Amino acid sequence: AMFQIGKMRYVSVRDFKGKVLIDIREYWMDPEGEMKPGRKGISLNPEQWSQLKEQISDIDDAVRKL
Amino acid sequence: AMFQIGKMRYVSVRDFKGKVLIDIREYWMDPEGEMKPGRKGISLNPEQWSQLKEQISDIDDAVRKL
Amino acid sequence: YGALDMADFEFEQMFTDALGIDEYGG
């Protein structure tokens, strides 16, 4: 699965080894026609996924404080 | 502005030159005792940040579907 | 495929780093 959160920024979500590969990274175009991640990005650990969502309320609040 | 979202992974919402950036990066402890931001991570702006939260309804579905 | 496969082999690089560390404890 490939979601999008911004221009040239897609979220890679697929089966990998023995876990769900959730990688949020910039997506560049392949010479052929596909798209793949670059360098700027971070993978969302299954455990981090929950913590991040829960911290969103505080994170978002900090954004409005700046 | 330092929100822990996992182990060695912290979301830092800092204003950079007049731009509130939600930098989701890793932090490794130096020999001194301070956590320094690693090279692996991504700086999301409020715009992409909003989309990320909105895309959760889609991403979470793929994560909850093992 | 040129970049597709290239930016795939390096997926496990962060998989065994970011996608594998929170389940280590807590």
How many strands in all of chain A?
A: 4
Tell me what portion of residues of chain C adopts beta-strand conformation: under 5%
Q: Return the structural class of chain C.
A: mainly alpha
> Separation of termini of chain C?
39 Å
The beta-strand count of chain C equals 0
Largest interface: A-B, 32 and 35 residues
Biggest sheet: strand arrangement of chain A: 1-2-3-4
> What's the gyration radius of chain A in Å?
14 Å
Oligomerization category of the chains in this entry: heterotrimer
SS field, number of helical segments of chain C: 2
What characteristic shape of chain A results from the CA principal axes? flat
What is the straight-line distance between the termini of chain A? 34 Å
Modified residues (N6-acetyllysine) (chains A, B): 7
Protein name (chains A, B): Activated RNA polymerase II transcriptional coactivator p15
Main location (chains A, B): nucleus
Keywords (chains A, B): Acetylation, Activator, DNA-binding, Isopeptide bond, Nucleus, Phosphoprotein, Transcription, Transcription regulation, Ubl conjugation
Describe the structure.
- The complex is a heterotrimer, with 2 copies of chain A (66 residues) and 1 copy of chain C (26 residues).
- With 66 residues, chain A is α+β, with helices and mostly antiparallel strands.
- Chain A has a single domain, classed as Transcriptional Co-activator pc4, Chain A, CATH 2.30.31.
- Helix content of chain A is 27%, strand content 50%.
- In chain A, a hairpin with a 2-residue loop joins strand 1 (2-6) and strand 2.
- Chain C has 26 residues and is an all-alpha fold.
- The termini of chain C are far apart.
- The chains are: A alpha+beta (66), C mainly alpha (26).
- At the A-B interface, strand 1, strand 2, strand 3, strand 4 and helix 1 of A face strand 2, strand 3, strand 4 and helix 1 of B.
